[PDB]
Amino acid sequence: GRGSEFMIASVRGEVLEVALDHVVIEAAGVGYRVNATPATLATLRQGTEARLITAMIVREDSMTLYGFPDGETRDLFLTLLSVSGVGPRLAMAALAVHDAPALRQVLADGNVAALTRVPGIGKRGAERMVLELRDKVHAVRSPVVEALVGLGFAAKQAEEATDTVLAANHDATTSSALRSALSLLGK
Amino acid sequence: GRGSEFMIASVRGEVLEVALDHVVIEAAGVGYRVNATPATLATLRQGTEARLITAMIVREDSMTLYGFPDGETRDLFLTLLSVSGVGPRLAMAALAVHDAPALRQVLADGNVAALTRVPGIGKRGAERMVLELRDKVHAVRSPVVEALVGLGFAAKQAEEATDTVLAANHDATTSSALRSALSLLGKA
Amino acid sequence: GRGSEFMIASVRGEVLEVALDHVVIEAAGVGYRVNATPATLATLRQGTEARLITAMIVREDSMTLYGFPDGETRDLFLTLLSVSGVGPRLAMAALAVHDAPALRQVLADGNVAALTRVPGIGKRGAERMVLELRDKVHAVRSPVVEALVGLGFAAKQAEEATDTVLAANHDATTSSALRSALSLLGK
Amino acid sequence: GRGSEFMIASVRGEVLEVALDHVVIEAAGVGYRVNATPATLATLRQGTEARLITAMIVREDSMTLYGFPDGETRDLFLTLLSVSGVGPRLAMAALAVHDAPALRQVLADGNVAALTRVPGIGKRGAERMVLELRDKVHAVRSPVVEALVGLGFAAKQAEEATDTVLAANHDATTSSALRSALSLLGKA
Amino acid sequence: GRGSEFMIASVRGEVLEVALDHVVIEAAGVGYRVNATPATLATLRQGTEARLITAMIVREDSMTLYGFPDGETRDLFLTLLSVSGVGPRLAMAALAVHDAPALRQVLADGNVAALTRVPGIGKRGAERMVLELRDKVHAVRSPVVEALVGLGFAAKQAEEATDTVLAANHDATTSSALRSALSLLGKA
Amino acid sequence: GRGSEFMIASVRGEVLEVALDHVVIEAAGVGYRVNATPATLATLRQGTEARLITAMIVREDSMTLYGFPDGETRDLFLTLLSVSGVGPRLAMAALAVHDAPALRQVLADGNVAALTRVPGIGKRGAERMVLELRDKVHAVRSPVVEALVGLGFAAKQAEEATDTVLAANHDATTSSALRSALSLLGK
Amino acid sequence: GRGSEFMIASVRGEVLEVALDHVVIEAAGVGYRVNATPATLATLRQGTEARLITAMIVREDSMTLYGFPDGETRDLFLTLLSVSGVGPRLAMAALAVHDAPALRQVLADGNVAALTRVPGIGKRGAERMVLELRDKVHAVRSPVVEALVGLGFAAKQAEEATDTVLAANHDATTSSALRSALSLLGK
Amino acid sequence: GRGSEFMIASVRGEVLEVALDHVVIEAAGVGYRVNATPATLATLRQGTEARLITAMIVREDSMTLYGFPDGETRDLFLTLLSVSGVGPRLAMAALAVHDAPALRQVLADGNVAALTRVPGIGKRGAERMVLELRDKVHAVRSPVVEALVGLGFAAKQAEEATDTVLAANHDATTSSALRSALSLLGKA
């Protein structure tokens, strides 16, 4: 029941405008407005071609883009959104204050004081978050087991089947292992 | 009353990212995220130009793409969605487990055991599906009636007319066959 | 309170697929599916570049395109939609049976029998429609005052103005007339 | 709680149609319809490439674009929308009658008679507006603190932090301040 | 597809307040507000027990009652609402001006001038209405077919059957006539 | 995820009006309109006090009551509604044609011809329904474990419990069994 | 386009509970919760029969009652709601602080300081309100002219017709004047 | 921004049906269905007059009642609903398993094992809850200030005002304070 999938996952074009809370990348003829942390905007230079990994949020009366330097960050954004009470604006505020690397450690360390330093986040609030996602921020194995659970399998069920595929083909990809694990799992 | 029509029916561009449950095709300047079965993702190679026949799902708070190698598969996806209780994720799960060819036979054969092996599908569930669509997976003759049918007509009426036109002009194409018929039924 | 304005008013690209009830035009990299009457689809040829004047319909759980050879037809489509009880599909059915020219006369003539010939349209239904829009299917003076009225003005004020501008620059474009008339009405 | 952010902030392409209340710019292959004042449409020439800074409005049953020559104007549009009772059509009507420069002075002067000259705007109406936004139509200190306040801070804290930064780098820019002020504000 | 069915079809209690556009009937302990034409309100007397045949309108953000002296009138109200463009307030305005008997003749006569005299109704408007419902304002025979008709049948089918039953049992009531017919069409 | 619970489950008052498709029961001072099959309406007599077991349906722009002679029938109504494509009106049509007893056998027998005899029900439609609910139309042990499972428990835990309580108080009511079994499962 | 009409306009029963922000009146068997100012609650006494003139607010996910000692107050409540930015809770807060009589003068006097004394109301806010409704807080004439405008007539049009009716029947009611004015206005 | 207020806060009538997951109380002529824990249903006896303190939940497509023996319990129900992820069915499940007294201690003790004993509640889930409301399950000073805070005031102001009042009338009641504190707070 975990909410994850949007449509526009990045925008690449010429920077038309760099503001303090967003940017305007022109892809094709369209100027998309993507909001962003100053940290992100910082690297941007009007007149230059640039790409931002974006997350798209559609609501009944809204259709907005949030951009980031890379996928890891964007993904972090989405994660933040999962905590109830934490909305896009909020999440952006936190990242604006604490870059992805920092914000990640802040949570994993359990560092609450750092979080309260972010407007909108109450003492109680900081805790819930750290709880919700301290343990949420070539391997091959953990990648493929991770995915089989999304297709609605179990942890154990998926780990059995995975060791199995690798037990037979060690030098296999993270993809051909997936298909071999599934072609295996549909009996 | 059958739900069928979307807007983005395909995306062609450069592959920016190949994941385990989706891909990112960059069309124009935009990186569209389309979800896909590993089977589909398998053929894809980052840095290469590629095209996926997609189905688009819009909901109040969501706007998602599902991609597939070809039209037949994508159409199969839509079909699956018709069964109540069966949602996009579910349908993708099934195709992820059983490729289109396989999944098709699984239904036509009536093969229930195969279906239950798909997470989220209960014994009762598998049956309903097989029921709902065992008989749903230059012809010229049947596509024309199929058209008329969706224009909200009836299977004798539009059958008789298609029959009638293919009778009088033999070197006629599925579409000229379609217009000719429509000219008749609007009682010229 | 009359509903009129959408966003995608046309699509130009390569025809990827011509079906019996729609087409797939590829603009940029995107393959847009626009539905269409066989009459319209008829002219289309896969592999060829083509343009369709489209009407866009967005609903909570839907986002669809309807395409047409020209603006006059597309506009007629929208009109049809205005009649309550008449939905996009219905409207398309009617045009599929009666081309724009025909369908227009069918209404203006008041020809009800022709309309009932269209699935979904009952006897009662045909009448309401003919009622609703029998009187609804280089000029210059008329278009401008109409636009102004369209902004909430009063035909007299809007004639005074227009007549003024046109008297001053007889060879005026309809549009310059519009600017030049409003430039007047703020005083 | 102030509503501000959309997605399509401009459209650049070839002008396909210039009407009296809108234009059709073709970006990529798509013809986007953006509504506009005759004043704006005036400068436009079919067959020519053009760009309009747009504001996008999405509602349950609607998805519309409004275009303008530049950012200042488009922003003014959004502002007008903030006044309750004032909708997109209305706001467009006012700008159609009074160009941005004019319309701005009209409000700052407090000139009510001018506003009532716009259909849909009652006497009472004109006042509310002038009220709501008479005081709303290398600087550096201010821009910066404005931003923070937007990130949810308080004018006190935002300023305090800021003098503190610019102290340390009088040389600073409007953004390089912003970050340092955020570094600062994070108790680093 | 015709919209007809609500929940509160009447309110009986003590009149607590008689206004110019509504009344407050207290049923049980609850004071229901039902709106009404002065014509209707006219008969009402505060402190007295009274009953109004009501029509209930629920919308996302609204839950309102409209009351009338009798069923025929209330039903007339609903009818008016069927015409698109005609809302509850409008319909109440018309009845407020023209009592049910009058308003009925106004339509059946086709009398357009009378209708335009009602605020909100334009010349074009009056016509559409007269069109839409000039032919819409122990019978035993027609109520039975009327029933079947709303059960989603057709006017020959249900006509033939009603015909057929009234033929074989003569001392039969509109309802026994209804069941008997339904027993037939479910192909006993 | 199964939709079941409403608020007005019955109405008792004086019959003010008996029509062909509904009745008006006056409870307290309010005249509630409940729709009903002629079969149901048949038994009703204006001027008499009567009670109808009702199902309530609320939608954004609607608030309607459907009434029935007894609980078993009303419940059957709800069931019918579960089949997608089958709306309140439809469901009422079916019951109007086939009384509860009949309509129940029609499904359990699998009798499709009978169902198509009902307007709005297509051949395809009849089948789906029979599929969906052929196996869906003083016990004691069964009702309790079922309720417990109904709260998310596991038949085994819920049998252990029940069996325990019933072994201890054989003459137990189904309900006391329920309390006494849960009083157990918190430990 | 002015929003005014609800359904439950009062509740009369036995007071079951008197709290600090609401009360529970039991009408028939139902305990309705109506929210109220302490000022209002003050007069209330549990175990006693009481009546509160109520305003009902229904929203997609809400159905709430607000009660008041009399109609004038309740009506004032509704008025407050008309100011955008001012919600039920807010309006109640203001009345909780300033009784109807007081709150009325506060607005008519134009007294802004008094309004800012109410939590949630900013300086800017207080002004808008005073603006919006300073001129909004047996005559016979003004009553009946007031009503004809709601039926969608004009001020002048309605005043002409009204003087007319009274010019002919001075000793007429505020009601028989209304019908005589309308029976007159439908020509 | 805390969600609290409904309309039907109790139902009193004759018990028409006692089930395993709900009851049917007939108030006036209406049979209201209120859902309840077996614990609660236990005390109920068909044919008898009874009262349940209820909480009402209205959603776009739903309108449901949940009943409880007393106010403290019903309030506890609402509380549980505040935890995101915890819905009416869930909350009812927990109370069904753990009576109000028990369930209260379970949280205040911080007893997680007990909570996981409730279907739908995961390990992670139990923690969040205990977190969210361990400190949430003639006094006079406090009640009073609580109220004000509810009217939008700030704990500082609310208290300050309050000591100031009770100073002037040590004798005061929880409400007669409230008003005076509001008199006060209005700068009288």
Side-chain angles (χ1 to χ4, degrees), chain A residues 1 3 7-104 106-122 125-134 136-137 139-155 157-170 172-187, chain B residues 1 3 7-104 106-116 118-122 125-134 136-137 139-155 157-170 172-188, chain C residues 1 3 7-104 106-122 125-134 136-137 139-155 157-170 172-187, chain D residues 1 3 7-104 106-122 125-134 136-137 139-155 157-170 172-188, chain E residues 1 3 7-104 106-116 118-122 125-134 136-137 139-155 157-170 172-188, chain F residues 1 3 7-104 106-122 125-134 136-137 139-155 157-170 172-187, chain G residues 1 3 7-104 106-122 125-134 136-137 139-155 157-170 172-187, chain H residues 1 3 7-104 106-122 125-134 136-137 139-155 157-170 172-188:
Chain A
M7 175 180 318
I8 306 202
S10 95
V11 196
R12 230 207 70 246
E14 175 196 349
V15 188
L16 296 185
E17 180 193 347
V18 191
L20 295 245
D21 68 334
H22 69 259
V23 59
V24 177
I25 317 169
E26 170 171 279
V30 184
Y32 294 84
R33 167 191 224 249
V34 296
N35 310 322
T37 69
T40 305
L41 304 154
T43 114
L44 295 174
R45 179 60 178 163
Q46 161 168 358
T48 290
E49 175 280 335
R51 174 158 72 203
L52 250 66
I53 278 46
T54 71
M56 172 161 157
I57 296 173
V58 296
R59 297 294 159 192
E60 175 181 326
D61 289 328
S62 71
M63 204 164 291
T64 320
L65 289 198
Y66 302 84
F68 308 92
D70 58 42
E72 355 305 340
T73 312
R74 195 268 318 278
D75 289 355
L76 172 47
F77 182 73
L78 280 323
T79 306
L80 296 152
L81 290 182
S82 77
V83 195
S84 199
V86 167
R89 275 193 290 287
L90 177 63
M92 285 293 290
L95 295 174
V97 179
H98 301 296
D99 308 8
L103 181 40
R104 270 188 253 253
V106 179
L107 302 157
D109 295 334
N111 181 354
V112 161
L115 295 183
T116 299
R117 301 195 196 118
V118 168
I121 293 179
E127 281 148 349
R128 316 210 232 106
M129 300 179 41
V130 163
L131 170 58
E132 249 98 307
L133 62 80
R134 177 165 35 200
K136 273 201 72 186
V137 207
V140 182
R141 186 178 187 282
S142 210
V144 171
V145 287
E146 210 188 30
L148 298 166
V149 190
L151 296 150
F153 291 110
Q157 186 173 355
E159 281 179 293
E160 311 194 37
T162 299
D163 306 308
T164 296
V165 174
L166 294 175
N169 204 356
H170 322 89
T173 50
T174 175
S175 59
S176 63
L178 177 63
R179 330 159 215 153
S180 297
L182 286 180
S183 206
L184 188 147
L185 276 159
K187 287 217 264 185
Chain B
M7 176 182 317
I8 306 205
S10 64
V11 194
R12 249 216 40 269
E14 175 195 350
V15 189
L16 294 188
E17 181 192 347
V18 191
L20 295 174
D21 65 336
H22 69 258
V23 59
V24 176
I25 294 169
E26 170 168 276
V30 184
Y32 297 84
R33 166 190 226 248
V34 296
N35 309 322
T37 66
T40 306
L41 295 174
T43 189
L44 295 174
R45 154 162 192 295
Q46 157 168 2
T48 290
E49 158 178 2
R51 175 157 74 201
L52 253 47
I53 276 47
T54 72
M56 168 160 161
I57 296 176
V58 296
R59 232 93 285 195
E60 175 179 326
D61 288 329
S62 178
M63 206 165 285
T64 321
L65 286 201
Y66 303 83
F68 308 93
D70 58 39
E72 295 85 357
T73 311
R74 194 269 321 277
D75 292 353
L76 172 47
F77 181 75
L78 279 321
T79 304
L80 296 152
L81 293 182
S82 79
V83 194
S84 200
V86 166
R89 275 193 289 286
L90 188 147
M92 286 291 293
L95 295 174
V97 184
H98 302 296
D99 308 8
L103 181 40
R104 270 189 250 256
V106 180
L107 302 157
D109 296 334
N111 180 351
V112 163
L115 295 184
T116 299
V118 166
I121 293 180
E127 281 147 350
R128 315 208 232 106
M129 302 176 41
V130 160
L131 169 58
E132 250 98 305
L133 62 80
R134 178 165 35 200
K136 272 202 71 187
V137 206
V140 173
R141 178 159 194 276
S142 206
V144 177
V145 281
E146 189 187 284
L148 302 180
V149 162
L151 293 197
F153 281 81
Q157 186 173 175
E159 254 200 308
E160 314 190 30
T162 310
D163 286 346
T164 283
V165 189
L166 303 180
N169 203 6
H170 331 123
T173 65
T174 193
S175 69
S176 64
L178 177 63
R179 308 165 240 143
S180 302
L182 276 176
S183 175
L184 232 312
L185 292 150
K187 274 158 178 150
Chain C
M7 173 184 321
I8 306 203
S10 95
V11 194
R12 232 207 68 250
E14 175 196 349
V15 188
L16 297 186
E17 179 192 349
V18 193
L20 286 284
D21 65 336
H22 69 258
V23 61
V24 178
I25 303 301
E26 168 168 279
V30 186
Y32 296 85
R33 168 191 224 248
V34 296
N35 311 320
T37 64
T40 305
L41 295 166
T43 59
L44 295 174
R45 184 64 180 86
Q46 160 167 0
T48 290
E49 92 114 51
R51 175 157 72 202
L52 251 49
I53 278 46
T54 72
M56 171 163 161
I57 294 173
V58 296
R59 300 288 182 268
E60 176 181 328
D61 288 331
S62 178
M63 203 164 292
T64 319
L65 290 198
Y66 301 85
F68 308 92
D70 56 41
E72 295 85 357
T73 311
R74 195 268 318 278
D75 293 353
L76 168 49
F77 180 74
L78 279 322
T79 303
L80 296 150
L81 292 181
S82 79
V83 193
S84 202
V86 167
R89 271 197 288 290
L90 212 341
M92 288 291 291
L95 275 66
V97 182
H98 301 294
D99 308 8
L103 180 41
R104 274 187 249 256
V106 177
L107 303 156
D109 295 337
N111 177 356
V112 162
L115 297 183
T116 299
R117 301 197 194 118
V118 170
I121 294 180
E127 279 149 351
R128 318 208 231 107
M129 300 177 43
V130 160
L131 167 59
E132 249 99 307
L133 62 80
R134 177 164 35 200
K136 272 203 72 187
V137 207
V140 207
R141 179 170 192 251
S142 196
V144 172
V145 288
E146 220 188 30
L148 290 171
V149 155
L151 310 177
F153 289 106
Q157 254 204 131
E159 288 172 335
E160 297 193 32
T162 295
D163 288 345
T164 295
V165 179
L166 295 171
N169 206 355
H170 320 289
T173 84
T174 189
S175 68
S176 64
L178 229 211
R179 338 148 182 188
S180 273
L182 282 151
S183 188
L184 237 345
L185 297 162
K187 299 163 189 163
Chain D
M7 178 178 315
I8 308 203
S10 95
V11 193
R12 230 206 69 249
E14 172 197 351
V15 187
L16 297 185
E17 180 192 348
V18 191
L20 295 174
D21 68 336
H22 68 261
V23 59
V24 177
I25 294 169
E26 170 171 277
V30 188
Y32 295 83
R33 165 192 224 249
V34 296
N35 305 325
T37 69
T40 303
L41 295 155
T43 189
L44 295 174
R45 177 64 160 86
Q46 160 166 1
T48 290
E49 90 107 52
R51 175 152 74 201
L52 252 47
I53 279 47
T54 71
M56 172 163 159
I57 294 173
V58 175
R59 297 294 181 192
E60 176 181 326
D61 288 329
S62 149
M63 202 163 290
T64 318
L65 287 201
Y66 302 84
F68 308 93
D70 57 39
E72 295 85 357
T73 310
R74 193 272 318 276
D75 294 351
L76 170 48
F77 180 75
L78 279 323
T79 302
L80 297 150
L81 291 182
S82 78
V83 193
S84 200
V86 166
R89 273 193 292 286
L90 212 341
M92 284 295 290
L95 275 66
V97 182
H98 300 294
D99 309 7
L103 180 41
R104 273 188 249 254
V106 177
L107 302 156
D109 297 336
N111 178 354
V112 162
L115 296 184
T116 59
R117 304 197 195 117
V118 169
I121 293 181
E127 280 150 349
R128 315 210 231 107
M129 300 179 40
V130 161
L131 170 58
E132 249 97 306
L133 29 75
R134 178 165 35 200
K136 273 203 71 189
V137 207
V140 176
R141 190 210 193 195
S142 192
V144 171
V145 325
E146 200 187 46
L148 306 170
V149 171
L151 294 157
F153 288 106
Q157 281 187 112
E159 282 201 355
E160 280 194 45
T162 299
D163 295 327
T164 294
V165 177
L166 308 171
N169 199 16
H170 328 114
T173 57
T174 175
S175 72
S176 69
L178 224 196
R179 320 160 215 168
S180 299
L182 295 160
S183 271
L184 211 294
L185 268 154
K187 278 170 190 152
Chain E
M7 176 182 317
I8 306 205
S10 64
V11 194
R12 249 216 40 269
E14 175 195 350
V15 189
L16 294 188
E17 181 192 347
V18 191
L20 295 174
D21 65 336
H22 69 258
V23 59
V24 176
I25 294 169
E26 170 168 276
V30 184
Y32 297 84
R33 166 190 226 248
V34 296
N35 309 322
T37 66
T40 306
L41 295 174
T43 189
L44 295 174
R45 154 162 192 295
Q46 157 168 2
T48 290
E49 158 178 2
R51 175 157 74 201
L52 253 47
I53 276 47
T54 72
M56 168 160 161
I57 296 176
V58 296
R59 232 93 285 195
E60 175 179 326
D61 288 329
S62 178
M63 206 165 285
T64 321
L65 286 201
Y66 303 83
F68 308 93
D70 58 39
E72 295 85 357
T73 311
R74 194 269 321 277
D75 292 353
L76 172 47
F77 181 75
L78 279 321
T79 304
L80 296 152
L81 293 182
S82 79
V83 194
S84 200
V86 166
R89 275 193 289 286
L90 188 147
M92 286 291 293
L95 295 174
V97 184
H98 302 296
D99 308 8
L103 181 40
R104 270 189 250 256
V106 180
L107 302 157
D109 296 334
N111 180 351
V112 163
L115 295 184
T116 299
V118 166
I121 293 180
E127 281 147 350
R128 315 208 232 106
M129 302 176 41
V130 160
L131 169 58
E132 250 98 305
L133 62 80
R134 178 165 35 200
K136 272 202 71 187
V137 206
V140 173
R141 178 159 194 276
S142 206
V144 177
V145 281
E146 189 187 284
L148 302 180
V149 162
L151 293 197
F153 281 81
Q157 186 173 175
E159 254 200 308
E160 314 190 30
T162 310
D163 286 346
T164 283
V165 189
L166 303 180
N169 203 6
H170 331 123
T173 65
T174 193
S175 69
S176 64
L178 177 63
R179 308 165 240 143
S180 302
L182 276 176
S183 175
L184 232 312
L185 292 150
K187 274 158 178 150
Chain F
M7 173 184 321
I8 306 203
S10 95
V11 194
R12 232 207 68 250
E14 175 196 349
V15 188
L16 297 186
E17 179 192 349
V18 193
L20 286 284
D21 65 336
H22 69 258
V23 61
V24 178
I25 303 301
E26 168 168 279
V30 186
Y32 296 85
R33 168 191 224 248
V34 296
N35 311 320
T37 64
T40 305
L41 295 166
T43 59
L44 295 174
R45 184 64 180 86
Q46 160 167 0
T48 290
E49 92 114 51
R51 175 157 72 202
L52 251 49
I53 278 46
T54 72
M56 171 163 161
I57 294 173
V58 296
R59 300 288 182 268
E60 176 181 328
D61 288 331
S62 178
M63 203 164 292
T64 319
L65 290 198
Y66 301 85
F68 308 92
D70 56 41
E72 295 85 357
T73 311
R74 195 268 318 278
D75 293 353
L76 168 49
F77 180 74
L78 279 322
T79 303
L80 296 150
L81 292 181
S82 79
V83 193
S84 202
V86 167
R89 271 197 288 290
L90 212 341
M92 288 291 291
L95 275 66
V97 182
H98 301 294
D99 308 8
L103 180 41
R104 274 187 249 256
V106 177
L107 303 156
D109 295 337
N111 177 356
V112 162
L115 297 183
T116 299
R117 301 197 194 118
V118 170
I121 294 180
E127 279 149 351
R128 318 208 231 107
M129 300 177 43
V130 160
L131 167 59
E132 249 99 307
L133 62 80
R134 177 164 35 200
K136 272 202 72 187
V137 207
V140 207
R141 179 170 192 251
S142 196
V144 172
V145 288
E146 220 188 30
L148 290 171
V149 155
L151 310 177
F153 289 106
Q157 254 204 131
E159 288 172 335
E160 297 193 32
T162 295
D163 288 345
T164 295
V165 179
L166 295 171
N169 206 355
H170 320 289
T173 84
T174 189
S175 68
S176 64
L178 229 211
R179 338 148 182 188
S180 273
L182 282 151
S183 188
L184 237 345
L185 297 162
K187 299 163 189 163
Chain G
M7 175 180 318
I8 306 202
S10 95
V11 196
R12 230 207 70 246
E14 175 196 349
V15 188
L16 296 185
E17 180 193 347
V18 191
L20 295 245
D21 68 334
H22 69 259
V23 59
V24 177
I25 317 169
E26 170 171 279
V30 184
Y32 294 84
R33 167 191 224 249
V34 296
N35 310 322
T37 69
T40 305
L41 304 154
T43 114
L44 295 174
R45 179 60 178 163
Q46 161 168 358
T48 290
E49 175 280 335
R51 174 158 72 203
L52 250 66
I53 278 46
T54 71
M56 172 161 157
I57 296 173
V58 296
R59 297 294 159 192
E60 175 181 326
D61 289 328
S62 71
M63 204 164 291
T64 320
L65 289 198
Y66 302 84
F68 308 92
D70 58 42
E72 355 305 340
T73 312
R74 195 268 318 278
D75 289 355
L76 172 47
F77 182 73
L78 280 323
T79 306
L80 296 152
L81 290 182
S82 77
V83 195
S84 199
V86 167
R89 275 193 290 287
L90 177 63
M92 285 293 290
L95 295 174
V97 179
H98 301 296
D99 308 8
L103 181 40
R104 270 188 253 253
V106 179
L107 302 157
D109 295 334
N111 181 354
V112 161
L115 295 183
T116 299
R117 301 195 196 118
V118 168
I121 293 179
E127 281 148 349
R128 316 210 232 106
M129 300 179 41
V130 163
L131 170 58
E132 249 98 307
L133 62 80
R134 177 165 35 200
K136 273 201 72 186
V137 207
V140 182
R141 186 178 187 282
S142 210
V144 171
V145 287
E146 210 188 30
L148 298 166
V149 190
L151 296 150
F153 291 110
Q157 186 173 355
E159 281 179 293
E160 311 194 37
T162 299
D163 306 308
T164 296
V165 174
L166 294 175
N169 204 356
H170 322 89
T173 50
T174 175
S175 59
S176 63
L178 177 63
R179 330 159 215 153
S180 297
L182 286 180
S183 206
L184 188 147
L185 276 159
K187 287 217 264 185
Chain H
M7 178 178 315
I8 308 203
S10 95
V11 193
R12 230 206 69 249
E14 172 197 351
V15 187
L16 297 185
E17 180 192 348
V18 191
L20 295 174
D21 68 336
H22 68 261
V23 59
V24 177
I25 294 169
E26 170 171 277
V30 188
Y32 295 83
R33 165 192 224 249
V34 296
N35 305 325
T37 69
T40 303
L41 295 155
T43 189
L44 295 174
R45 177 64 160 86
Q46 160 166 1
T48 290
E49 90 107 52
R51 175 152 74 201
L52 252 47
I53 279 47
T54 71
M56 172 163 159
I57 294 173
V58 175
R59 297 294 181 192
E60 176 181 326
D61 288 329
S62 149
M63 202 163 290
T64 318
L65 287 201
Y66 302 84
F68 308 93
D70 57 39
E72 295 85 357
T73 310
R74 193 272 318 276
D75 294 351
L76 170 48
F77 180 75
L78 279 323
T79 302
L80 297 150
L81 291 182
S82 78
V83 193
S84 200
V86 166
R89 273 193 292 286
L90 212 341
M92 284 295 290
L95 275 66
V97 182
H98 300 294
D99 309 7
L103 180 41
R104 273 188 249 254
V106 177
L107 302 156
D109 297 336
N111 178 354
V112 162
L115 296 184
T116 59
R117 304 197 195 117
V118 169
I121 293 181
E127 280 150 349
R128 315 210 231 107
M129 300 179 40
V130 161
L131 170 58
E132 249 97 306
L133 29 75
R134 178 165 35 200
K136 273 203 71 189
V137 207
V140 176
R141 190 210 193 195
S142 192
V144 171
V145 325
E146 200 187 46
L148 306 170
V149 171
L151 294 157
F153 288 106
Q157 281 187 112
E159 282 201 355
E160 280 194 45
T162 299
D163 295 327
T164 294
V165 177
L166 308 171
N169 199 16
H170 328 114
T173 57
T174 175
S175 72
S176 69
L178 224 196
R179 320 160 215 168
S180 299
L182 295 160
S183 271
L184 211 294
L185 268 154
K187 278 170 190 152

